[PDB]
A paper describes a structure:
Composed of a diverse array of proteins, the tegument is an amorphous aggregate sandwiched between herpesviruses’ icosahedral capsid and outer envelope. While tegument proteins in general are well-differentiated to carry out highly host-specific viral functions, tegument proteins related to the capsid vertex-specific component (CVSC) have in recent years been identified as key players mediating critical functions universal to all herpesviruses. We resolve atomic structures of portal vertex-associated tegument (PVAT) and identify multiple configurations of PVAT arising from layered reorganization of pUL77, pUL48 (large tegument protein), and pUL47 (inner tegument protein) assemblies. Analyses show that pUL77 seals the last-packaged viral genome end through electrostatic interactions, pUL77 and pUL48 harbor a head–linker–capsid-binding motif conducive to PVAT reconfiguration, and pUL47/48 dimers form 45-nm-long filaments extending from the portal vertex.
Comparing subparticle reconstructions of VC1 and NC1 portal vertex, we observe analogous PVAT architecture characterized by three distinct layers of tegument protein that stack successively atop the portal complex and its integral DNA translocation channel. Hence, our VC1/NC1 PVAT structure accounts for the tegument proteins of all five CVSC asymmetric units encircling a portal vertex. We thus characterize VC1/NC1-decorated portal vertices as a fully tegumented state in which the entire complement of CVSC tegument proteins and pUL47 exhibit stable and orderly binding. For all copies of pUL48 visible in our VC1/NC1 reconstructions, an accompanying copy of pUL47 (of similar density strength to pUL48) can be seen closely bound, forming a pUL47/48 dimer. Interasymmetric unit interactions of VC1/NC1 LTL are heavily pUL47-mediated, with both upper and lower pUL47/48 dimers contributing to assembly. While the primary means of VC1/NC1 PVAT attachment to the capsid is through CBD helices that integrate with triplex-bound pUL93, additional interactions facilitated by small capsid proteins (SCPs), which sit atop major capsid protein (MCP) capsomers, likely confer stability to the top-heavy LTL.
Numbering used by the authors:
A (entry chain G): 298 to 592
B (entry chain T): 44 to 156, 162 to 290
C (entry chain K): 246 to 588
D (entry chain G): 1 to 176
E (entry chain K): 1029 to 1370
F (entry chain H): 1 to 49
G (entry chain V): 6 to 116, 121 to 248, 258 to 306
H (entry chain U): 4 to 242, 254 to 306
The structure:
């Protein structure tokens, strides 16, 4: 009568246990080898020549640089536009200001701020946090729809008199992400989700917390802020609400390089979520150690 | 109201069963004249894999009687086929003693104006500890496949769950050992074809405050029981689950 | 008690009156014990009477017009004939209601006990007879319950200690007498019972006390306060600087002439004991849990809620667990280890 | 345990089809913190050859090799690239043990008999038991292959690590 | 002494005799000639007889008054035993199994048990995880639902009838139906409490998210896992939802007190269990309406207890202080006179 | 949802009303379920449907 | 509770005598009217040569089954029973009964008095059978159905000959072959192909569904499922699936097992506690 | 024990409520606890329904509630009678389903009706008298099959490919009326059924004899027909004398296959509660026997 795979698997047991680290040397984890795995019966080969390791390390260099290259591209665009317009920049974010002030010190503080931001370039940043929704499948159709509907001639009268309503394209509130740098105590705020609105009185921008409260930056001389829009417009603003603006340029990368890295996840259905598309959901299952385990 | 039937049994089977309250089962064996032999849970406790050794030996001494041996010997051939060989006849209310005895059991009824159903202790278990107001009660057989041969377990259990599907859903939950042992038997030896892991029969409903624990005596020997003080009988079919 | 009850909508003025003496104002009903106590206590005011009572129930029958309106519209308007006649004639008022039109004119006499309460004459019933030998409790036998509370382990300030009973009781100098770590109660009958902290262990050891997960959850949910004094309380910055050149970098932090905000925990330590509970204690919205610290602080210039355990009991706020109390706990520890004459 | 055994079985059923061999891994309080291991929803892995090419594609490149489009009607190969990327990730099996344990004591409480060379017994606050497959281009493993570990939580956030096969197999295989 | 202090809360039931007043023809009783219904069998036949009563109230105020005139027995032990918090929250355990078992043994509790599945909780009326004691010469187990308390909570708070949570919460003072103002009154700590003007006398109970609040508010219990059969004295002070729900007008809250706010407690079991069969009588709870608790005789050392037992009747009423030893005198002269004079 | 207009038009019987507390307090504190209070003479009752 | 039935034809004294012999039989009718015509009584209305057993089994399950009563002049009374009440039923089946049996009904298969005929209409009553015999004979007929395509081989001929005969306590049978003219009827055809295809569908589907289920909470019973599936796959080798295709296959599995429910389920109708010494008739409790 | 269940209503019911509740005599209303004196707040399915949670749990709670017939509605007392097994009772249907003769009826939680009326019966406060649907067997086992198959298919599928399938699977047409399955969440209450189904399918796959496996291919060698062609297309891309023959082998293997198919079928089945007799022509009410 038959021997069972699990029984000989148990009785054979294991004898191998070692820890391995990720290439960045940031995480450790254990690998276990069972003496009844079919790995031992296979008797296949192994090769670890130096050229292959060198090529893999070059691929890793690209994988790492995918974010810092976007940082560098936006930096170079900032400087290029700063020379382009002669450095004299208009007001773009609304706040009251004085003509009798030492603007030179704020210019030097701006230099300090951009240098300090360049040092603290990181994977979490407004450019990456704005890129990530751009990669999702909906963004192509959504931006296509937004451009198409924006590209609408003024309605003929019968269109407005009859049928389903006419509508306005954008909502009154914009969704933004920003990088906040403070020089008086070297400190940079990168993972910021922020709301923005374009003022009706003047065409300038008012910026709000994700509570409805106004932000404090424009008043504080020691702070500079970077802004990116959901359509990837871009601003670098120094105290007084004066900003440098340009496109976020990303033609310096191939599609797969950034796409494989920053692909936002989409779920596959597992216990504790509704089969109807996008329906409301209960609180998470969370198999947990604080309660007596169920079967 | 109640419906009654009359039966003949010989004394050797009746001895410990002679007390008024019991549950009666019929054995069919491929013999020629004694095809059907009438046995009870008191005798079946000898082969119940879930009863303790001391009570097992107590019943072994109690049913040394000659006919009970041959009755027990017929249980040997086929553990998986046990519930096939069994058929149930309700619970007993009458007794007259003799070499050949006349006893009566009800198939569907109660006693107007005492009528209890006795259970040997290790045959009893509950999935509740605060009893519901109305308790449905069952005879269930579960098979232990993890061995050199399969051994049968016997239980009578009380539960308020009336719907069969949810009932078996929880029974599988607590009897997962027998499911896994069944599949272990299947993976081990495909030569003999095993049937279900457990068998349910529905017979009864009672009120929780009318459930008593009781002490029982026969032949100056003494065994303790759980009893359903006012038993209502509604005999169902054996139903299988894996 | 009697005068508070408002008089009825109506009355048969001839029903339930003492044959010659008085009109009955109300009836008082209570169990045999209370009624007997009253009969013994207020003996001078209690007297036996014979009163005129209605011999039979009032028989109310309905008009056929009411039957028709009932079948059609599902309603009654009692004494339909009277309403119709008064609306036809133009009379404003009706002489009596539908229920004064019942229970009438059959008086037979019965004898009761009565009590005099000024103008009021009141009947007294001891409903013993109606319930004896029966299986139901008298509905005037009631269960009432109360909620009680008492402290244990509470500690009195040493700064203002006083005695009111010095000549009555004198205690040994020991620290156990000094520090109130137990409490004593009375049983259902007057007998002494004692609660130590040991008796509390069945509750105080439960994980539910020690898990602030709902505490932190609702601390975050409520949101930070918008009041300007609280607003200056909210600001606080923490971050994890690298430790590599930590020593050599120390002077560069002080080169910057910028003062730093006190943490909430730092501010909480200057409120003296007697006013830690007052409104002027800004930090009070923080103090949710004895074992745990809560705070709002900043990261990424966002305001977040931080929770952290008070590893040692010394970390408790001074206002809630003062220093002299710690000195007394240390003296209790030394007394327990019999070191109170410290080597 | 049970996931390791089950996946070692399941990979054998599809060794010829997938050309992947099973690899059994354990995670602790140094890879992810307690609440993350308590609320973990998915685990995914993705293979990379020594040349930096994913396995959801033919070696001879793909149309995704093009530079970024920067368009708006197309985002970056909007649907095509997204679906190819969803193709290039495979899903692994996992189990969570929400209690502190000694790994050898847990395994001997289980049916196994761990026969390690000396008492380097290790303690951990919690354990999750993942298992991954790594691919055989031919019946051989390239030491410069890279294998990626991805972990996803109910809020859709994810963590991503990558390991090169040489460290896993350093002398597990060259001795074999 | 650990680094904190405790305050206990317990509910004791009294069996009482009450006297009632009612004026002549307070209400009219309407009755019908009885209806007879028949069920017949071949062995015996049974008759069911029915008669309907309709009572029409015949006054515009309150025509009847009651008062709890007399009492002689306490159904509860007046004990000081602590609630078994493990039984009410049964599923929860410590992370490390060894320390969990150590705590279970040290504090004397059984193993954790899974709660009854929703289908079972529907089919049977509660789990009742705690059994009857073998004997009890005293009455029911008046379980004290302890709440935590700073070491230096103001001693005077316990000498008069107060809310044990440390803040005023009687919804008679708040303007009716102003739920916003009522939640402000119960939870705001920049507006002082209405009873003992201050932010709070217990900062670990009186504000949302305190350990007392999550322990004893039924909402936080519902978010957790617990057994609802176990009646808890402390819940009536912390159940924000129906405290606010009672914020109605004067006469409606009087009618709710006398009709709806009554408690139901099983009379047979030692542990105070809730009851919904209706066959059991309801219980009158003045503390619910007043939303306060009563102080009871308690003392630190046997010295003061003995000197109060020594002195003449009435010494129980006073509250006394020794250097570090306090006495809390009972606010109503219950224990010494009212119970035992009978 | 009472027929207050019918109550106004229908004949009525007079009683010496005795409120425990002042009538406007009894109405304002809603000792009575269902109410209607109006001031002056409100002509709502002068039409019949 | 009564049902009346009238015969259109005449009735000789011999025919009414032949009828009264059945005064305790189990006579079913398609549905319950107060008065029914004689055609609907019995299974005769369903006896088309092209259909046979399996469909008639489900028809007998669906119909109402009644007991007979003593007869008026030209009109027979049928007594519809009630649950939990005892009645006297006559054993028309060729089996002996014992006090305590569970009884089931199935259409007749192996048949002078049966010609209770009033011209080309015959009162074919159902069989009353002890439940284990009914289950086993259902199994045996179904297995005969499976060999139907291979009758050319001599050993399977002998196997069928052995299957057909069943022996019971003092009883023997010869069960007719479900194939006529070496061809299979349509109801048996559907039943057997559906059984075979649910087997095949299980074999194909369970391998992918065990993985799809295993990702979440894989456990020992599922591992045993995997072991048996792998061995079955290897033993069958002796020598990226689209959504809608999977939907079709999964639906087909369940609809196929739904067709089998006629032969899978075996419900009880009568349980007996009495028997005549003559064994001509018994008394039973009614079920179902 | 007690054959009559008394329901007490806690409101001063007006003419409208007492009239419209009189309109529902001999309707089926579910009761949890089966006791003498019961309050209206624990009558019907109102407390057990919660849209954020699944239809599966509502069905599970419904199977265990007991059924009663409503009669003799009088002042604040509703007098529910419990039907006894094997007697003749009249019932009033709630859903738009049409009842034939001979059909067996099973109880299911109400569905989302095609034009979504719901007709707002008895909203006496925050409460509402939610009644279950009484449905004939084919539709009940059809919807159980649909829920189970939707759970089986849905796992490990992303949402976008799910949507197209479920929009086709969710809607069931039956006797010219069409209904939608409301809330098919993948609950662990459904995982238990799926696990049992998977085990049963594996077992029936394993122990089936070689002849049972080979029959349809032998039939394709034998015959050609539309049903067989559809089966062939079903098996298309997944695709002599027996090595030894024996009858008793087939008996044993087939009996095991039957017990396993019984498990798998039971996962679809629901327990019958009524068998119908000839029906009032307006579908309003039918006469039925109470089964179980």
């Amino acid at each position: 009568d038959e021997v069972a795979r699990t029984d000989e698997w148990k009785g054979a047991g294991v004898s191998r246990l070692r820890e391995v680290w990720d290439v960045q040397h940031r995480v450790r984890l254990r690998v276990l080898w069972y003496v009844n795995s079919f790995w031992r019966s296979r008797e296949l080969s192994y090769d670890d020549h130096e050229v292959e390791l060198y090529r893999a390390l070059d691929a890793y260099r690209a994988r790492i640089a995918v974010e810092y290259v976007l940082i560098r591209a936006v930096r170079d665009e900032i400087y290029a536009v700063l020379r382009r317009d002669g450095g004299a920049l208009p007001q773009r974010f609304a706040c009251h200001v004085s003509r009798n002030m030492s603007w030179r010190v704020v210019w030097e503080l701006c230099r300090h701020a951009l240098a300090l931001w360049m040092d603290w370039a990181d994977v979490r940043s407004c450019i990456i946090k704005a890129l990530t929704p751009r990669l999702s499948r909906g963004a192509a159709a959504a931006a296509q729809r937004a451009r198409r509907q924006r590209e609408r001639s003024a309605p003929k009268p019968q269109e407005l008199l009859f049928g389903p309503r006419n509508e306005s394209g954008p909502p009154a509130e914009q969704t933004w992400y920003a990088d906040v740098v403070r020089c008086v105590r070297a400190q940079v705020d990168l993972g910021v989700e922020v709301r923005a609105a374009r003022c009706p009185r003047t065409g300038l921008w008012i910026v709000r917390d994700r509570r409805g409260r106004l932000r404090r930056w424009l008043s504080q001389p020691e702070v500079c802020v970077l802004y990116v829009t959901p359509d990837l417009d871009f601003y670098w603003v120094l105290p007084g609400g004066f900003a440098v603006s340009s496109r976020v340029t990303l033609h310096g990368l191939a599609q797969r390089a950034l796409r494989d890295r920053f692909q936002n996840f989409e779920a596959v259905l597992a216990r504790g979520m509704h089969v109807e598309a996008g329906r409301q959901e209960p609180e998470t299952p969370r198999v947990s150690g604080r309660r007596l385990p169920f079967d | 109201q109640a419906l009654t039937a009359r039966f003949f049994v010989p004394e050797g089977l009746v001895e410990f069963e002679a007390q008024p309250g019991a549950l009666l089962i019929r054995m069919e064996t491929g013999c020629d004249s004694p095809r059907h032999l009438y046995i009870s849970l008191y005798l079946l406790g000898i082969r119940a894999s879930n009863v303790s050794a001391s009570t097992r030996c107590l019943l072994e001494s109690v049913y040394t009687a000659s006919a009970a041996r041959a009755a027990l010997q017929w249980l040997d051939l086929g553990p998986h086929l046990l519930h096939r060989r069994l058929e149930t006849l309700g619970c007993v209310k009458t007794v007259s003693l003799g070499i050949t005895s006349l006893l009566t059991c009800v198939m569907r009824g109660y006693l107007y104006n005492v009528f209890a159903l006795m259970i040997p202790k290790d045959m009893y278990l509950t999935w509740e500890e605060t009893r519901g107001r109305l308790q449905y009660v069952y005879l269930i057989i579960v098979y232990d496949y993890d061995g050199p041969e399969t051994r049968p377990g016997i239980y009578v259990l009380t539960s308020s769950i009336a719907h069969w599907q949810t009932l078996v859903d929880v029974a599988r939950g607590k009897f997962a050992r027998e499911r896994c042992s069944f599949v272990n038997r299947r993976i081990t030896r495909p030569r003999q074809i095993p049937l279900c892991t457990g068998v349910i029969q529905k017979l009864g409903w009672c009120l929780a405050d009318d459930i008593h624990t009781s002490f029982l005596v026969h032949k100056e020997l003494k065994l303790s029981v759980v009893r359903l003080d006012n038993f209502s009988v509604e005999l169902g079919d054996f139903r299988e689950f894996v | 008690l009697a005068e508070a009850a408002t008089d009825s909508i109506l009355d048969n003025p001839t029903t339930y009156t003492t044959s010659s003496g008085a009109k009955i104002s109300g009836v008082m009903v209570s169990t045999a014990n209370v009624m007997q106590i009253i009969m013994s206590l207020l003996s001078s005011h209690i007297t036996k009477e014979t009163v005129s009572a209605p011999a039979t129930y009032g028989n109310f029958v309905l008009s056929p017009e009411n039957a028709v309106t009932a079948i059609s519209y599902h309603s009654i308007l009692a004494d339909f004939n009277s309403y119709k006649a008064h609306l036809t004639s133009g009379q404003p008022h009706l002489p009596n209601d539908s229920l004064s039109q019942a229970g009438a004119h059959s008086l037979t006499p019965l004898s009761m006990d009565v009590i005099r309460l000024g103008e009021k004459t009141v009947i007294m019933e001891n409903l013993r007879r109606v319930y004896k030998n029966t299986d139901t409790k008298d509905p005037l036998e009631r269960n009432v319950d109360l909620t009680f509370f008492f402290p244990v382990g509470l500690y009195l300030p040493e700064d203002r200690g006083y005695t009111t009973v010095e000549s009555k009781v004198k205690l040994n100098d020991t620290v156990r007498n000094a520090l109130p770590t137990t409490a004593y109660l009375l049983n259902r009958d007057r007998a002494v019972q004692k609660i130590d902290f040991v008796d509390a262990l069945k509750t105080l050891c439960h994980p539910v006390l020690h898990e602030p997960a709902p505490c932190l959850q609702t601390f975050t949910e409520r949101g930070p306060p918008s009041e300007p004094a609280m607003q200056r309380l909210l600001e606080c910055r923490f971050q994890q600087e690298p430790m590599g050149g930590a020593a050599r970098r120390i002077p560069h932090f002080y080169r910057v002439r910028r003062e730093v905000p006190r943490t909430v925990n730092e501010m909480k330590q200057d409120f003296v004991v007697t006013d830690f509970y007052k409104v002027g204690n800004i930090t009070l919205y923080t103090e949710l849990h004895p074992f745990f610290d809560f705070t709002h602080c900043q990261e990424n210039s966002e305001t977040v809620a931080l929770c952290t355990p008070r590893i040692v009991i010394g970390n408790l706020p001074d206002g809630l667990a003062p220093g002299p109390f710690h000195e007394l706990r240390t003296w209790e520890i030394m007394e327990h280890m019999r070191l109170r004459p410290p080597p | 345990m049970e996931t390791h055994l089950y996946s070692d079985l399941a990979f054998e059923a599809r060794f010829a089809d997938d050309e992947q061999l099973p690899l059994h891994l354990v995670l602790d309080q140094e890879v992810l913190s307690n609440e993350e291991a308590e609320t973990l929803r998915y685990v995914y892995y993705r293979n990379v050859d020594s040349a930096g090419r994913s396995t959801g594609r033919a070696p001879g490149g793909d149309e995704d090799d093009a530079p970024a489009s920067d368009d708006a009607e197309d985002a970056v190969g909007g649907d095509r690239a997204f679906d190819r990327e969803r193709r290039t990730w495979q899903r692994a099996c996992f189990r969570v043990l929400p209690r502190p344990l000694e790994l050898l004591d847990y395994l001997r409480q289980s049916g196994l008999t761990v026969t390690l060379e000396k008492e380097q017994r290790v303690r951990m606050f919690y354990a999750v038991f993942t298992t991954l497959g790594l691919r055989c281009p031919d019946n051989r493993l390239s030491g410069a292959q890279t294998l990626h570990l991805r972990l996803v939580w109910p809020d859709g956030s994810y963590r991503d690590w990558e390991f090169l096969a040489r460290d896993l197999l350093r002398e597990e295989m060259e001795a074999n | 002494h650990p680094g904190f202090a405790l305050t206990a809360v317990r509910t004791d039931t009294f069996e009482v005799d009450m006297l009632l007043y009612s004026g002549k023809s307070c209400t009219s009783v309407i009755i019908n000639n009885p209806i007879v219904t028949k069920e017949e069998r071949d062995i015996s036949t049974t008759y069911h007889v029915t008669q309907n009563i309709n009572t029409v109230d015949m006054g515009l105020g309150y025509t009847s008054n009651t008062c709890v005139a007399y009492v002689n027995r306490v159904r509860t032990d007046m004990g000081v035993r602590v609630q078994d918090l493990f039984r009410v929250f049964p599923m929860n355990v410590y992370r490390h199994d060894e320390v969990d078992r150590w705590i279970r043994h040290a504090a004397g509790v059984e193993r954790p048990q899974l709660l009854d599945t929703e289908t079972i909780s529907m089919l049977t009326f509660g789990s009742m995880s705690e059994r009857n004691a073998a004997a009890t010469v005293h009455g029911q187990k008046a379980a004290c639902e302890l709440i935590l308390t700073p070491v230096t909570m103001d001693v005077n708070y316990f000498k008069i009838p107060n809310n044990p949570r440390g803040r005023a919460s009687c919804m008679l003072a708040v303007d009716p139906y102003d739920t916003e103002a009522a939640t402000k009154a119960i939870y705001d700590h920049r507006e002082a409490d209405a009873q003992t003007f201050a932010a709070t006398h217990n900062p670990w109970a009186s504000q949302a998210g305190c350990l007392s609040d999550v322990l004893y508010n039924t909402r936080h219990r519902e978010r957790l896992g617990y057994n609802s059969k176990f009646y808890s004295p402390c819940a009536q002070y912390f159940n924000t939802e129906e405290i606010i729900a009672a914020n109605k007008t004067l006469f409606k809250t009087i009618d709710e007190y006398l009709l709806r706010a009554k408690d139901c407690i099983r009379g047979d079991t030692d542990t105070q269990y809730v009851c919904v069969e209706g066959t059991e009588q309801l219980i009158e709870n003045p503390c619910r309406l007043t939303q306060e608790a009563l102080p009871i005789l308690s003392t630190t050392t046997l010295a003061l207890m003995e000197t109060k037992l020594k002195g003449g009747a009435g010494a129980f009423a006073t509250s006394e202080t020794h250097f570090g030893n306090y006495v809390v005198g009972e606010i109503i002269p219950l224990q010494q006179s009212m119970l035992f004079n009978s | 949802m009472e027929n207050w207009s019918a109550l106004e038009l229908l004949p009525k019987v007079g009683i010496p009303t005795d409120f425990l507390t002042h009538v406007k307090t009894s109405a304002g504190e809603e000792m009575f379920e269902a109410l209607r209070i109006y001031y002056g003479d409100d002509p709502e009752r002068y039409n019949i449907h | 509770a009564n049902i009346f039935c009238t015969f259109d034809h005449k009735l000789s004294i011999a025919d009414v005598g032949k009828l009264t012999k059945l005064v305790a039989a189990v006579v079913p009718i398609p549905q319950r009217l107060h008065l029914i015509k004689h055609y609907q009584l019995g299974l005769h209305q369903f006896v088309d040569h092209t259909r046979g057993y399996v469909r008639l089994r489900g028809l007998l399950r669906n119909m109402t089954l009644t007991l007979m009563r003593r007869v008026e002049g030209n009109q027979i009374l049928l007594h519809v029973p009630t649950h939990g009440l005892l009645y006297t039923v006559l054993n028309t089946g060729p089996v002996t009964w014992e006090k305590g049996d569970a009884l089931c009904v199935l259409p007749p298969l192996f048949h002078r008095e049966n010609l209770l005929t009033l011209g080309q209409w015959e009162l074919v009553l159902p069989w009353i059978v002890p439940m284990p015999l009914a289950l086993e004979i259902n199994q045996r007929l179904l297995i005969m159905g499976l060999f139907s395509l291979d009758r050319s081989y001599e050993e399977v001929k002998a196997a069928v000959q052995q299957l057909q005969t069943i022996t019971f306590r003092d009883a023997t049978f010869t069960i007719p072959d479900p194939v006529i003219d070496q061809h299979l009827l349509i109801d048996m055809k559907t039943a057997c192909l559906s059984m075979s295809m649910v087997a095949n569908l299980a074999s194909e589907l369970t391998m992918t569904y065990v993985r799809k289920l295993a990702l979440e909470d894989s456990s020992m019973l599922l591992v045993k499922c995997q072991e048996l599936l792998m061995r079955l796959d290897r033993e069958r080798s002796v020598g990226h699936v689209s959504p809608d295709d999977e939907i079709a296959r999964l639906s087909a599995l369940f609809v196929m097992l739904r067709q089998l429910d006629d032969l899978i389920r075996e419900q009880v109708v009568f349980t007996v506690c009495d028997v005549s010494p003559d064994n001509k008739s018994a008394t039973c409790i009614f079920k179902g």
